[PDB]
Protein backbone atom coordinates (compact mmCIF):
# COMPACT_ATOMS: atom_id res chain seq x y z
CA UNK A 1 0.00 0.00 0.00
CA UNK A 2 1.15 3.62 -0.57
CA UNK A 3 2.52 5.23 2.57
CA UNK A 4 1.40 8.74 1.61
CA UNK A 5 3.86 10.69 3.79
CA UNK A 6 6.80 8.51 2.70
CA UNK A 7 6.10 8.54 -1.05
CA UNK A 8 5.21 12.24 -1.09
CA UNK A 9 8.54 13.13 0.55
CA UNK A 10 10.31 10.64 -1.76
CA UNK A 11 8.74 12.41 -4.77
CA UNK A 12 9.85 15.78 -3.38
CA UNK A 13 13.43 14.58 -2.83
CA UNK A 14 14.02 12.46 -5.94
CA UNK A 15 11.57 13.97 -8.44
CA UNK A 16 9.97 17.39 -8.82
CA UNK A 17 6.90 18.76 -7.05
CA UNK A 18 5.57 22.33 -7.14
CA UNK A 19 3.60 23.84 -4.28
CA UNK A 20 0.46 26.01 -4.20
CA UNK A 21 -2.83 26.49 -6.07
CA UNK A 22 -1.43 28.95 -8.60
CA UNK A 23 1.36 26.66 -9.79
CA UNK A 24 -0.89 23.59 -9.62
CA UNK A 25 -3.34 25.31 -12.03
CA UNK A 26 -0.61 26.45 -14.42
CA UNK A 27 0.76 22.93 -14.68
CA UNK A 28 -2.77 21.53 -15.09
CA UNK A 29 -3.53 23.91 -18.02
CA UNK A 30 -0.33 22.89 -19.85
CA UNK A 31 -0.80 19.21 -18.97
CA UNK A 32 2.50 19.30 -17.09
CA UNK A 33 1.56 17.63 -13.81
CA UNK A 34 1.19 13.87 -13.37
CA UNK A 35 -0.88 14.20 -10.19
CA UNK A 36 -2.41 17.06 -8.23
CA UNK A 37 -2.90 16.64 -4.48
CA UNK A 38 -5.33 18.94 -2.65
CA UNK A 39 -5.78 19.28 1.12
CA UNK A 40 -9.31 18.53 2.26
CA UNK A 41 -9.70 22.15 3.44
CA UNK A 42 -8.46 23.73 0.20
CA UNK A 43 -10.73 26.67 -0.65
CA UNK A 44 -13.85 25.21 -2.38
CA UNK A 45 -13.57 27.30 -5.55
CA UNK A 46 -9.83 26.54 -5.83
CA UNK A 47 -10.41 22.80 -5.38
CA UNK A 48 -13.10 23.02 -8.10
CA UNK A 49 -10.78 24.93 -10.47
CA UNK A 50 -8.03 22.38 -9.94
CA UNK A 51 -10.47 19.51 -10.51
CA UNK A 52 -11.73 21.20 -13.68
CA UNK A 53 -8.35 21.93 -15.27
CA UNK A 54 -7.04 18.49 -14.28
CA UNK A 55 -10.08 16.86 -15.91
CA UNK A 56 -9.41 18.72 -19.18
CA UNK A 57 -5.94 17.15 -19.35
CA UNK A 58 -6.70 13.74 -17.76
CA UNK A 59 -4.55 14.49 -14.71
CA UNK A 60 -5.62 12.57 -11.63
CA UNK A 61 -6.48 14.54 -8.51
CA UNK A 62 -6.01 13.08 -5.04
CA UNK A 63 -7.58 14.56 -1.92
CA UNK A 64 -5.27 14.37 1.08
CA UNK A 65 -7.23 13.39 4.19
CA UNK A 66 -5.56 16.12 6.32
CA UNK A 67 -5.52 19.90 6.50
CA UNK A 68 -3.31 22.34 4.63
CA UNK A 69 -1.33 22.65 7.89
CA UNK A 70 -0.65 18.88 7.99
CA UNK A 71 0.29 18.89 4.26
CA UNK A 72 2.66 21.86 4.70
CA UNK A 73 4.26 20.10 7.67
CA UNK A 74 4.70 16.89 5.65
CA UNK A 75 6.40 18.96 2.90
CA UNK A 76 8.83 20.53 5.41
CA UNK A 77 7.19 23.96 5.31
CA UNK A 78 6.25 26.28 8.19
CA UNK A 79 3.19 27.51 6.24
CA UNK A 80 0.02 25.96 4.84
CA UNK A 81 0.00 24.12 1.53
CA UNK A 82 -3.49 23.71 0.02
CA UNK A 83 -2.40 22.04 -3.21
CA UNK A 84 0.67 20.71 -4.98
CA UNK A 85 1.55 19.16 -8.32
CA UNK A 86 3.74 16.15 -8.88
CA UNK A 87 5.61 17.00 -12.08
CA UNK A 88 8.10 14.12 -11.77
CA UNK A 89 7.52 11.27 -9.26
CA UNK A 90 11.27 10.55 -9.12
CA UNK A 91 11.83 7.10 -7.61
CA UNK A 92 8.54 7.25 -5.68
CA UNK A 93 5.27 5.35 -6.04
CA UNK A 94 3.17 8.51 -5.43
CA UNK A 95 1.38 8.22 -8.79
CA UNK A 96 -0.37 5.01 -7.66
CA UNK A 97 -2.78 7.38 -5.84
CA UNK A 98 -4.21 8.34 -9.26
CA UNK A 99 -5.82 4.89 -9.47
PDB file of N, CA and C in Angstrom:
ATOM      1  N   UNK A   1       0.852  -1.215   0.000  1.00  0.00           N
ATOM      2  CA  UNK A   1       0.000   0.000   0.000  1.00  0.00           C
ATOM      3  C   UNK A   1       0.878   1.252   0.000  1.00  0.00           C
ATOM      4  N   UNK A   2       0.428   2.331  -0.651  1.00  0.00           N
ATOM      5  CA  UNK A   2       1.152   3.615  -0.568  1.00  0.00           C
ATOM      6  C   UNK A   2       1.106   4.222   0.836  1.00  0.00           C
ATOM      7  N   UNK A   3       2.295   4.412   1.394  1.00  0.00           N
ATOM      8  CA  UNK A   3       2.517   5.227   2.569  1.00  0.00           C
ATOM      9  C   UNK A   3       2.589   6.667   2.043  1.00  0.00           C
ATOM     10  N   UNK A   4       1.515   7.429   2.238  1.00  0.00           N
ATOM     11  CA  UNK A   4       1.402   8.744   1.612  1.00  0.00           C
ATOM     12  C   UNK A   4       2.558   9.668   1.983  1.00  0.00           C
ATOM     13  N   UNK A   5       2.793   9.820   3.286  1.00  0.00           N
ATOM     14  CA  UNK A   5       3.859  10.686   3.787  1.00  0.00           C
ATOM     15  C   UNK A   5       5.218  10.275   3.209  1.00  0.00           C
ATOM     16  N   UNK A   6       5.512   8.981   3.221  1.00  0.00           N
ATOM     17  CA  UNK A   6       6.800   8.508   2.698  1.00  0.00           C
ATOM     18  C   UNK A   6       6.977   8.791   1.203  1.00  0.00           C
ATOM     19  N   UNK A   7       5.998   8.384   0.402  1.00  0.00           N
ATOM     20  CA  UNK A   7       6.100   8.535  -1.052  1.00  0.00           C
ATOM     21  C   UNK A   7       6.045  10.003  -1.488  1.00  0.00           C
ATOM     22  N   UNK A   8       5.283  10.825  -0.769  1.00  0.00           N
ATOM     23  CA  UNK A   8       5.212  12.244  -1.091  1.00  0.00           C
ATOM     24  C   UNK A   8       6.587  12.885  -0.879  1.00  0.00           C
ATOM     25  N   UNK A   9       7.209  12.595   0.262  1.00  0.00           N
ATOM     26  CA  UNK A   9       8.542  13.134   0.552  1.00  0.00           C
ATOM     27  C   UNK A   9       9.541  12.571  -0.464  1.00  0.00           C
ATOM     28  N   UNK A  10       9.398  11.294  -0.805  1.00  0.00           N
ATOM     29  CA  UNK A  10      10.310  10.642  -1.758  1.00  0.00           C
ATOM     30  C   UNK A  10      10.199  11.286  -3.150  1.00  0.00           C
ATOM     31  N   UNK A  11       8.981  11.664  -3.531  1.00  0.00           N
ATOM     32  CA  UNK A  11       8.745  12.408  -4.765  1.00  0.00           C
ATOM     33  C   UNK A  11       9.414  13.780  -4.725  1.00  0.00           C
ATOM     34  N   UNK A  12       9.260  14.471  -3.596  1.00  0.00           N
ATOM     35  CA  UNK A  12       9.853  15.784  -3.375  1.00  0.00           C
ATOM     36  C   UNK A  12      11.375  15.736  -3.498  1.00  0.00           C
ATOM     37  N   UNK A  13      11.973  14.691  -2.929  1.00  0.00           N
ATOM     38  CA  UNK A  13      13.428  14.585  -2.826  1.00  0.00           C
ATOM     39  C   UNK A  13      14.110  14.016  -4.071  1.00  0.00           C
ATOM     40  N   UNK A  14      13.421  13.139  -4.792  1.00  0.00           N
ATOM     41  CA  UNK A  14      14.016  12.456  -5.944  1.00  0.00           C
ATOM     42  C   UNK A  14      13.387  12.859  -7.270  1.00  0.00           C
ATOM     43  N   UNK A  15      12.261  13.566  -7.222  1.00  0.00           N
ATOM     44  CA  UNK A  15      11.567  13.973  -8.439  1.00  0.00           C
ATOM     45  C   UNK A  15      11.449  15.478  -8.486  1.00  0.00           C
ATOM     46  N   UNK A  16      10.242  15.958  -8.771  1.00  0.00           N
ATOM     47  CA  UNK A  16       9.968  17.387  -8.821  1.00  0.00           C
ATOM     48  C   UNK A  16       8.494  17.590  -8.486  1.00  0.00           C
ATOM     49  N   UNK A  17       8.246  18.309  -7.393  1.00  0.00           N
ATOM     50  CA  UNK A  17       6.899  18.762  -7.046  1.00  0.00           C
ATOM     51  C   UNK A  17       6.889  20.281  -6.941  1.00  0.00           C
ATOM     52  N   UNK A  18       5.741  20.883  -7.244  1.00  0.00           N
ATOM     53  CA  UNK A  18       5.574  22.326  -7.139  1.00  0.00           C
ATOM     54  C   UNK A  18       4.386  22.608  -6.234  1.00  0.00           C
ATOM     55  N   UNK A  19       4.547  23.603  -5.370  1.00  0.00           N
ATOM     56  CA  UNK A  19       3.604  23.839  -4.283  1.00  0.00           C
ATOM     57  C   UNK A  19       2.699  25.040  -4.542  1.00  0.00           C
ATOM     58  N   UNK A  20       1.428  24.904  -4.158  1.00  0.00           N
ATOM     59  CA  UNK A  20       0.463  26.006  -4.195  1.00  0.00           C
ATOM     60  C   UNK A  20      -0.564  25.897  -5.309  1.00  0.00           C
ATOM     61  N   UNK A  21      -1.731  26.505  -5.091  1.00  0.00           N
ATOM     62  CA  UNK A  21      -2.830  26.488  -6.066  1.00  0.00           C
ATOM     63  C   UNK A  21      -2.453  27.089  -7.408  1.00  0.00           C
ATOM     64  N   UNK A  22      -1.778  28.239  -7.373  1.00  0.00           N
ATOM     65  CA  UNK A  22      -1.427  28.947  -8.602  1.00  0.00           C
ATOM     66  C   UNK A  22      -0.629  28.052  -9.526  1.00  0.00           C
ATOM     67  N   UNK A  23       0.484  27.533  -9.013  1.00  0.00           N
ATOM     68  CA  UNK A  23       1.364  26.659  -9.791  1.00  0.00           C
ATOM     69  C   UNK A  23       0.666  25.370 -10.208  1.00  0.00           C
ATOM     70  N   UNK A  24      -0.111  24.793  -9.303  1.00  0.00           N
ATOM     71  CA  UNK A  24      -0.885  23.590  -9.621  1.00  0.00           C
ATOM     72  C   UNK A  24      -1.819  23.805 -10.825  1.00  0.00           C
ATOM     73  N   UNK A  25      -2.461  24.972 -10.896  1.00  0.00           N
ATOM     74  CA  UNK A  25      -3.336  25.315 -12.025  1.00  0.00           C
ATOM     75  C   UNK A  25      -2.550  25.499 -13.318  1.00  0.00           C
ATOM     76  N   UNK A  26      -1.455  26.254 -13.254  1.00  0.00           N
ATOM     77  CA  UNK A  26      -0.606  26.449 -14.423  1.00  0.00           C
ATOM     78  C   UNK A  26      -0.177  25.142 -15.048  1.00  0.00           C
ATOM     79  N   UNK A  27       0.315  24.226 -14.210  1.00  0.00           N
ATOM     80  CA  UNK A  27       0.764  22.928 -14.677  1.00  0.00           C
ATOM     81  C   UNK A  27      -0.397  22.111 -15.229  1.00  0.00           C
ATOM     82  N   UNK A  28      -1.553  22.199 -14.582  1.00  0.00           N
ATOM     83  CA  UNK A  28      -2.767  21.534 -15.089  1.00  0.00           C
ATOM     84  C   UNK A  28      -3.183  22.034 -16.485  1.00  0.00           C
ATOM     85  N   UNK A  29      -3.174  23.349 -16.704  1.00  0.00           N
ATOM     86  CA  UNK A  29      -3.531  23.909 -18.022  1.00  0.00           C
ATOM     87  C   UNK A  29      -2.624  23.421 -19.146  1.00  0.00           C
ATOM     88  N   UNK A  30      -1.324  23.331 -18.865  1.00  0.00           N
ATOM     89  CA  UNK A  30      -0.327  22.894 -19.846  1.00  0.00           C
ATOM     90  C   UNK A  30      -0.177  21.380 -19.905  1.00  0.00           C
ATOM     91  N   UNK A  31      -0.857  20.669 -19.005  1.00  0.00           N
ATOM     92  CA  UNK A  31      -0.802  19.214 -18.968  1.00  0.00           C
ATOM     93  C   UNK A  31       0.523  18.729 -18.426  1.00  0.00           C
ATOM     94  N   UNK A  32       1.128  19.533 -17.557  1.00  0.00           N
ATOM     95  CA  UNK A  32       2.496  19.304 -17.093  1.00  0.00           C
ATOM     96  C   UNK A  32       2.626  18.527 -15.788  1.00  0.00           C
ATOM     97  N   UNK A  33       1.536  18.395 -15.053  1.00  0.00           N
ATOM     98  CA  UNK A  33       1.561  17.630 -13.812  1.00  0.00           C
ATOM     99  C   UNK A  33       1.087  16.207 -14.087  1.00  0.00           C
ATOM    100  N   UNK A  34       1.580  15.269 -13.288  1.00  0.00           N
ATOM    101  CA  UNK A  34       1.190  13.869 -13.370  1.00  0.00           C
ATOM    102  C   UNK A  34       0.180  13.506 -12.272  1.00  0.00           C
ATOM    103  N   UNK A  35       0.101  14.347 -11.248  1.00  0.00           N
ATOM    104  CA  UNK A  35      -0.884  14.203 -10.191  1.00  0.00           C
ATOM    105  C   UNK A  35      -0.992  15.531  -9.474  1.00  0.00           C
ATOM    106  N   UNK A  36      -2.201  15.894  -9.091  1.00  0.00           N
ATOM    107  CA  UNK A  36      -2.412  17.057  -8.233  1.00  0.00           C
ATOM    108  C   UNK A  36      -3.009  16.565  -6.915  1.00  0.00           C
ATOM    109  N   UNK A  37      -2.437  17.019  -5.805  1.00  0.00           N
ATOM    110  CA  UNK A  37      -2.900  16.641  -4.485  1.00  0.00           C
ATOM    111  C   UNK A  37      -3.456  17.903  -3.846  1.00  0.00           C
ATOM    112  N   UNK A  38      -4.672  17.814  -3.307  1.00  0.00           N
ATOM    113  CA  UNK A  38      -5.328  18.939  -2.653  1.00  0.00           C
ATOM    114  C   UNK A  38      -5.635  18.543  -1.214  1.00  0.00           C
ATOM    115  N   UNK A  39      -5.374  19.457  -0.279  1.00  0.00           N
ATOM    116  CA  UNK A  39      -5.776  19.284   1.115  1.00  0.00           C
ATOM    117  C   UNK A  39      -7.292  19.328   1.205  1.00  0.00           C
ATOM    118  N   UNK A  40      -7.852  18.641   2.195  1.00  0.00           N
ATOM    119  CA  UNK A  40      -9.306  18.531   2.257  1.00  0.00           C
ATOM    120  C   UNK A  40      -9.961  19.889   2.509  1.00  0.00           C
ATOM    121  N   UNK A  41      -9.213  20.805   3.121  1.00  0.00           N
ATOM    122  CA  UNK A  41      -9.700  22.145   3.439  1.00  0.00           C
ATOM    123  C   UNK A  41      -9.247  23.208   2.436  1.00  0.00           C
ATOM    124  N   UNK A  42      -8.744  22.791   1.270  1.00  0.00           N
ATOM    125  CA  UNK A  42      -8.460  23.734   0.197  1.00  0.00           C
ATOM    126  C   UNK A  42      -9.736  24.525  -0.097  1.00  0.00           C
ATOM    127  N   UNK A  43      -9.583  25.804  -0.391  1.00  0.00           N
ATOM    128  CA  UNK A  43     -10.735  26.673  -0.649  1.00  0.00           C
ATOM    129  C   UNK A  43     -11.626  26.028  -1.734  1.00  0.00           C
ATOM    130  N   UNK A  44     -12.937  25.917  -1.479  1.00  0.00           N
ATOM    131  CA  UNK A  44     -13.855  25.207  -2.383  1.00  0.00           C
ATOM    132  C   UNK A  44     -13.718  25.581  -3.853  1.00  0.00           C
ATOM    133  N   UNK A  45     -13.642  26.874  -4.151  1.00  0.00           N
ATOM    134  CA  UNK A  45     -13.573  27.302  -5.553  1.00  0.00           C
ATOM    135  C   UNK A  45     -12.224  26.926  -6.180  1.00  0.00           C
ATOM    136  N   UNK A  46     -11.161  26.967  -5.377  1.00  0.00           N
ATOM    137  CA  UNK A  46      -9.829  26.544  -5.826  1.00  0.00           C
ATOM    138  C   UNK A  46      -9.768  25.039  -6.091  1.00  0.00           C
ATOM    139  N   UNK A  47     -10.323  24.241  -5.180  1.00  0.00           N
ATOM    140  CA  UNK A  47     -10.407  22.801  -5.380  1.00  0.00           C
ATOM    141  C   UNK A  47     -11.156  22.506  -6.693  1.00  0.00           C
ATOM    142  N   UNK A  48     -12.285  23.187  -6.883  1.00  0.00           N
ATOM    143  CA  UNK A  48     -13.096  23.019  -8.097  1.00  0.00           C
ATOM    144  C   UNK A  48     -12.358  23.421  -9.374  1.00  0.00           C
ATOM    145  N   UNK A  49     -11.609  24.521  -9.326  1.00  0.00           N
ATOM    146  CA  UNK A  49     -10.784  24.931 -10.471  1.00  0.00           C
ATOM    147  C   UNK A  49      -9.731  23.876 -10.795  1.00  0.00           C
ATOM    148  N   UNK A  50      -9.018  23.430  -9.764  1.00  0.00           N
ATOM    149  CA  UNK A  50      -8.027  22.378  -9.938  1.00  0.00           C
ATOM    150  C   UNK A  50      -8.657  21.139 -10.566  1.00  0.00           C
ATOM    151  N   UNK A  51      -9.785  20.706 -10.016  1.00  0.00           N
ATOM    152  CA  UNK A  51     -10.472  19.508 -10.510  1.00  0.00           C
ATOM    153  C   UNK A  51     -10.883  19.669 -11.978  1.00  0.00           C
ATOM    154  N   UNK A  52     -11.350  20.872 -12.309  1.00  0.00           N
ATOM    155  CA  UNK A  52     -11.729  21.195 -13.677  1.00  0.00           C
ATOM    156  C   UNK A  52     -10.542  21.121 -14.623  1.00  0.00           C
ATOM    157  N   UNK A  53      -9.485  21.884 -14.344  1.00  0.00           N
ATOM    158  CA  UNK A  53      -8.347  21.930 -15.271  1.00  0.00           C
ATOM    159  C   UNK A  53      -7.641  20.577 -15.383  1.00  0.00           C
ATOM    160  N   UNK A  54      -7.618  19.830 -14.283  1.00  0.00           N
ATOM    161  CA  UNK A  54      -7.039  18.486 -14.284  1.00  0.00           C
ATOM    162  C   UNK A  54      -7.852  17.547 -15.177  1.00  0.00           C
ATOM    163  N   UNK A  55      -9.176  17.655 -15.092  1.00  0.00           N
ATOM    164  CA  UNK A  55     -10.078  16.862 -15.909  1.00  0.00           C
ATOM    165  C   UNK A  55      -9.911  17.137 -17.398  1.00  0.00           C
ATOM    166  N   UNK A  56      -9.637  18.388 -17.769  1.00  0.00           N
ATOM    167  CA  UNK A  56      -9.414  18.719 -19.184  1.00  0.00           C
ATOM    168  C   UNK A  56      -8.233  17.956 -19.758  1.00  0.00           C
ATOM    169  N   UNK A  57      -7.196  17.777 -18.936  1.00  0.00           N
ATOM    170  CA  UNK A  57      -5.940  17.146 -19.354  1.00  0.00           C
ATOM    171  C   UNK A  57      -5.824  15.673 -18.968  1.00  0.00           C
ATOM    172  N   UNK A  58      -6.781  15.134 -18.218  1.00  0.00           N
ATOM    173  CA  UNK A  58      -6.704  13.744 -17.762  1.00  0.00           C
ATOM    174  C   UNK A  58      -5.694  13.519 -16.650  1.00  0.00           C
ATOM    175  N   UNK A  59      -5.471  14.556 -15.844  1.00  0.00           N
ATOM    176  CA  UNK A  59      -4.549  14.487 -14.713  1.00  0.00           C
ATOM    177  C   UNK A  59      -5.352  14.064 -13.494  1.00  0.00           C
ATOM    178  N   UNK A  60      -4.935  12.991 -12.833  1.00  0.00           N
ATOM    179  CA  UNK A  60      -5.620  12.568 -11.630  1.00  0.00           C
ATOM    180  C   UNK A  60      -5.459  13.582 -10.495  1.00  0.00           C
ATOM    181  N   UNK A  61      -6.509  13.722  -9.699  1.00  0.00           N
ATOM    182  CA  UNK A  61      -6.477  14.544  -8.514  1.00  0.00           C
ATOM    183  C   UNK A  61      -6.669  13.648  -7.304  1.00  0.00           C
ATOM    184  N   UNK A  62      -5.874  13.860  -6.264  1.00  0.00           N
ATOM    185  CA  UNK A  62      -6.011  13.078  -5.037  1.00  0.00           C
ATOM    186  C   UNK A  62      -6.266  14.011  -3.880  1.00  0.00           C
ATOM    187  N   UNK A  63      -7.326  13.761  -3.115  1.00  0.00           N
ATOM    188  CA  UNK A  63      -7.583  14.562  -1.924  1.00  0.00           C
ATOM    189  C   UNK A  63      -6.914  13.965  -0.687  1.00  0.00           C
ATOM    190  N   UNK A  64      -5.951  14.709  -0.163  1.00  0.00           N
ATOM    191  CA  UNK A  64      -5.269  14.368   1.076  1.00  0.00           C
ATOM    192  C   UNK A  64      -6.239  14.504   2.249  1.00  0.00           C
ATOM    193  N   UNK A  65      -6.267  13.479   3.093  1.00  0.00           N
ATOM    194  CA  UNK A  65      -7.227  13.391   4.192  1.00  0.00           C
ATOM    195  C   UNK A  65      -7.050  14.491   5.256  1.00  0.00           C
ATOM    196  N   UNK A  66      -5.888  15.134   5.277  1.00  0.00           N
ATOM    197  CA  UNK A  66      -5.556  16.116   6.318  1.00  0.00           C
ATOM    198  C   UNK A  66      -5.714  17.563   5.888  1.00  0.00           C
ATOM    199  N   UNK A  67      -5.390  18.477   6.799  1.00  0.00           N
ATOM    200  CA  UNK A  67      -5.524  19.897   6.505  1.00  0.00           C
ATOM    201  C   UNK A  67      -4.304  20.416   5.750  1.00  0.00           C
ATOM    202  N   UNK A  68      -4.413  21.653   5.287  1.00  0.00           N
ATOM    203  CA  UNK A  68      -3.309  22.338   4.631  1.00  0.00           C
ATOM    204  C   UNK A  68      -2.122  22.544   5.576  1.00  0.00           C
ATOM    205  N   UNK A  69      -2.398  22.610   6.880  1.00  0.00           N
ATOM    206  CA  UNK A  69      -1.329  22.652   7.892  1.00  0.00           C
ATOM    207  C   UNK A  69      -0.544  21.333   7.903  1.00  0.00           C
ATOM    208  N   UNK A  70      -1.263  20.221   7.987  1.00  0.00           N
ATOM    209  CA  UNK A  70      -0.653  18.881   7.987  1.00  0.00           C
ATOM    210  C   UNK A  70       0.161  18.606   6.697  1.00  0.00           C
ATOM    211  N   UNK A  71      -0.381  19.037   5.562  1.00  0.00           N
ATOM    212  CA  UNK A  71       0.285  18.889   4.261  1.00  0.00           C
ATOM    213  C   UNK A  71       1.559  19.744   4.179  1.00  0.00           C
ATOM    214  N   UNK A  72       1.468  20.997   4.620  1.00  0.00           N
ATOM    215  CA  UNK A  72       2.660  21.856   4.699  1.00  0.00           C
ATOM    216  C   UNK A  72       3.724  21.231   5.592  1.00  0.00           C
ATOM    217  N   UNK A  73       3.321  20.758   6.761  1.00  0.00           N
ATOM    218  CA  UNK A  73       4.260  20.098   7.670  1.00  0.00           C
ATOM    219  C   UNK A  73       4.925  18.869   7.043  1.00  0.00           C
ATOM    220  N   UNK A  74       4.141  18.041   6.365  1.00  0.00           N
ATOM    221  CA  UNK A  74       4.702  16.895   5.651  1.00  0.00           C
ATOM    222  C   UNK A  74       5.769  17.343   4.645  1.00  0.00           C
ATOM    223  N   UNK A  75       5.517  18.457   3.963  1.00  0.00           N
ATOM    224  CA  UNK A  75       6.404  18.961   2.901  1.00  0.00           C
ATOM    225  C   UNK A  75       7.601  19.769   3.435  1.00  0.00           C
ATOM    226  N   UNK A  76       7.729  19.829   4.756  1.00  0.00           N
ATOM    227  CA  UNK A  76       8.828  20.534   5.407  1.00  0.00           C
ATOM    228  C   UNK A  76       8.654  22.032   5.470  1.00  0.00           C
ATOM    229  N   UNK A  77       7.426  22.521   5.326  1.00  0.00           N
ATOM    230  CA  UNK A  77       7.188  23.965   5.310  1.00  0.00           C
ATOM    231  C   UNK A  77       6.510  24.457   6.590  1.00  0.00           C
ATOM    232  N   UNK A  78       6.864  25.670   7.022  1.00  0.00           N
ATOM    233  CA  UNK A  78       6.247  26.282   8.195  1.00  0.00           C
ATOM    234  C   UNK A  78       4.929  27.005   7.910  1.00  0.00           C
ATOM    235  N   UNK A  79       4.421  26.872   6.683  1.00  0.00           N
ATOM    236  CA  UNK A  79       3.191  27.514   6.238  1.00  0.00           C
ATOM    237  C   UNK A  79       2.247  26.459   5.665  1.00  0.00           C
ATOM    238  N   UNK A  80       1.007  26.862   5.411  1.00  0.00           N
ATOM    239  CA  UNK A  80       0.016  25.958   4.838  1.00  0.00           C
ATOM    240  C   UNK A  80       0.362  25.667   3.378  1.00  0.00           C
ATOM    241  N   UNK A  81      -0.023  24.476   2.937  1.00  0.00           N
ATOM    242  CA  UNK A  81      -0.002  24.123   1.527  1.00  0.00           C
ATOM    243  C   UNK A  81      -1.353  23.501   1.212  1.00  0.00           C
ATOM    244  N   UNK A  82      -2.121  24.146   0.338  1.00  0.00           N
ATOM    245  CA  UNK A  82      -3.487  23.712   0.022  1.00  0.00           C
ATOM    246  C   UNK A  82      -3.511  22.760  -1.165  1.00  0.00           C
ATOM    247  N   UNK A  83      -2.510  22.881  -2.028  1.00  0.00           N
ATOM    248  CA  UNK A  83      -2.403  22.038  -3.212  1.00  0.00           C
ATOM    249  C   UNK A  83      -0.962  21.963  -3.698  1.00  0.00           C
ATOM    250  N   UNK A  84      -0.630  20.867  -4.374  1.00  0.00           N
ATOM    251  CA  UNK A  84       0.674  20.708  -4.980  1.00  0.00           C
ATOM    252  C   UNK A  84       0.543  19.849  -6.237  1.00  0.00           C
ATOM    253  N   UNK A  85       1.534  19.944  -7.114  1.00  0.00           N
ATOM    254  CA  UNK A  85       1.547  19.165  -8.325  1.00  0.00           C
ATOM    255  C   UNK A  85       2.808  18.331  -8.387  1.00  0.00           C
ATOM    256  N   UNK A  86       2.629  17.041  -8.637  1.00  0.00           N
ATOM    257  CA  UNK A  86       3.739  16.146  -8.880  1.00  0.00           C
ATOM    258  C   UNK A  86       4.038  16.217 -10.372  1.00  0.00           C
ATOM    259  N   UNK A  87       5.160  16.848 -10.697  1.00  0.00           N
ATOM    260  CA  UNK A  87       5.612  16.998 -12.082  1.00  0.00           C
ATOM    261  C   UNK A  87       6.423  15.765 -12.508  1.00  0.00           C
ATOM    262  N   UNK A  88       7.225  15.254 -11.570  1.00  0.00           N
ATOM    263  CA  UNK A  88       8.104  14.118 -11.766  1.00  0.00           C
ATOM    264  C   UNK A  88       8.064  13.328 -10.446  1.00  0.00           C
ATOM    265  N   UNK A  89       7.603  12.080 -10.477  1.00  0.00           N
ATOM    266  CA  UNK A  89       7.525  11.273  -9.258  1.00  0.00           C
ATOM    267  C   UNK A  89       8.892  10.804  -8.737  1.00  0.00           C
ATOM    268  N   UNK A  90       9.947  11.000  -9.520  1.00  0.00           N
ATOM    269  CA  UNK A  90      11.272  10.546  -9.124  1.00  0.00           C
ATOM    270  C   UNK A  90      11.261   9.038  -9.009  1.00  0.00           C
ATOM    271  N   UNK A  91      11.768   8.530  -7.885  1.00  0.00           N
ATOM    272  CA  UNK A  91      11.832   7.097  -7.611  1.00  0.00           C
ATOM    273  C   UNK A  91      10.611   6.617  -6.819  1.00  0.00           C
ATOM    274  N   UNK A  92       9.670   7.526  -6.561  1.00  0.00           N
ATOM    275  CA  UNK A  92       8.541   7.253  -5.679  1.00  0.00           C
ATOM    276  C   UNK A  92       7.381   6.554  -6.389  1.00  0.00           C
ATOM    277  N   UNK A  93       6.493   5.992  -5.581  1.00  0.00           N
ATOM    278  CA  UNK A  93       5.270   5.349  -6.042  1.00  0.00           C
ATOM    279  C   UNK A  93       4.052   6.265  -5.841  1.00  0.00           C
ATOM    280  N   UNK A  94       4.276   7.574  -5.708  1.00  0.00           N
ATOM    281  CA  UNK A  94       3.174   8.509  -5.429  1.00  0.00           C
ATOM    282  C   UNK A  94       2.055   8.495  -6.481  1.00  0.00           C
ATOM    283  N   UNK A  95       2.381   8.157  -7.723  1.00  0.00           N
ATOM    284  CA  UNK A  95       1.378   8.222  -8.789  1.00  0.00           C
ATOM    285  C   UNK A  95       0.346   7.094  -8.725  1.00  0.00           C
ATOM    286  N   UNK A  96       0.628   6.058  -7.940  1.00  0.00           N
ATOM    287  CA  UNK A  96      -0.368   5.013  -7.656  1.00  0.00           C
ATOM    288  C   UNK A  96      -1.671   5.546  -7.055  1.00  0.00           C
ATOM    289  N   UNK A  97      -1.599   6.707  -6.393  1.00  0.00           N
ATOM    290  CA  UNK A  97      -2.778   7.383  -5.844  1.00  0.00           C
ATOM    291  C   UNK A  97      -3.778   7.861  -6.904  1.00  0.00           C
ATOM    292  N   UNK A  98      -3.326   7.995  -8.147  1.00  0.00           N
ATOM    293  CA  UNK A  98      -4.210   8.343  -9.262  1.00  0.00           C
ATOM    294  C   UNK A  98      -5.145   7.228  -9.710  1.00  0.00           C
ATOM    295  N   UNK A  99      -4.934   6.016  -9.202  1.00  0.00           N
ATOM    296  CA  UNK A  99      -5.824   4.890  -9.466  1.00  0.00           C
ATOM    297  C   UNK A  99      -5.487   4.174 -10.758  1.00  0.00           C
TER     298      UNK A  99
END
